[PDB]
Design a protein around this nucleic acid. Structure first.
Lengths: 96, 84, 62
DNA sequence: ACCGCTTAAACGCACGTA
DNA sequence: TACGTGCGTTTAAGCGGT
């Protein structure tokens, strides 16, 4: 039976998702998360649809960029695998 | 009348985080990344939403608008185009 | 009788805020309950939102 | 907010190897 | 030795109506 070697399909996915623009997190859980977080700041809140979509576009753009920097940190350490310490270095240097 | 308390962050699933990382150009991913990512996401969301709601409250509204979010993002140096 | 502040934790007050209330010296839901907002706010690491959540959930419990 | 149906994605596991 | 790949199962996201 056929099996691709470790890495081939990963690269295929990179090309695939860098080619496209669709949101990568599921709508409903993201919305649920947003409402949960919002509740600890202000009671009785409602949300415009486009407000939740705005938050998702912003969040996903942020995470993708962070993963770019994280990847650079992993490669810097002569690895190809990203690890929490890569994220933490990236966020420290960003001033986060 | 009642509506129940909930916990959500785990709804941002492993394959979703993987897709985000792929778009970020990542080829291989440690198992510990996912939880880490979730924490990071939560912090981000919290900050933005905290500001957004502040704007909402100033306008004496109960509905967070797209503009509330846009202003929060702008004032955090993360300008977003497309939702004005 | 008493309502130990532990039960407040199931209402969804985070456990760190309950530890801050015990450090302040509040050990029961009775203790948080019959106090105004400002008592909990003056405690280190407690915002006005957490104090409102505590009083509301304590009024649910008490 | 809810009901129902569908199906594709998630998940658990086995295994080999990078 | 931990992670990628593949496969069978199950779970829930998605879509459509109201």
């Amino acid at each position: 039976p056929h099996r691709y070697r470790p890495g081939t399909v990963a690269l295929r996915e990179i090309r695939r998702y860098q080619k496209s623009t669709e949101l990568l997190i599921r709508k409903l859980p993201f919305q649920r998360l947003v409402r949960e977080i919002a509740q600890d700041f202000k009671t009785d809140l409602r949300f415009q649809s486009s407000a939740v979509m705005a938050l998702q576009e912003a969040c996903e753009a942020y995470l993708v960029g962070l993963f770019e920097d994280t990847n650079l940190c992993a490669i810097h350490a002569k690895r190809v695998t990203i690890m929490p310490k890569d994220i933490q270095l990236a966020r420290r240097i960003r001033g986060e | 009348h009642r509506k129940v308390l909930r916990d959500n962050i785990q709804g941002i699933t492993k394959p979703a985080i993987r897709r985000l990382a792929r778009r970020g150009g990542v080829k291989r991913i440690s198992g510990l990344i996912y939880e880490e990512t979730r924490g990071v996401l939560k912090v981000f969301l919290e900050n933005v939403i905290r500001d957004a709601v502040t704007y909402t409250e100033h306008a004496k509204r109960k509905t967070v608008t797209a503009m509330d979010v846009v202003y929060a993002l702008k004032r955090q140096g993360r300008t977003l185009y497309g939702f004005g | 009788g008493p309502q130990p502040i532990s039960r407040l934790e199931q209402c969804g007050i985070n456990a760190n805020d309950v530890k801050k209330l015990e450090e302040a010296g509040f050990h029961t839901v009775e203790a948080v309950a019959y106090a105004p907002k400002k008592e909990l706010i003056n405690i280190k690491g407690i915002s006005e939102a957490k104090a409102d959540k505590i009083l509301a959930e304590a009024a649910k419990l008490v």
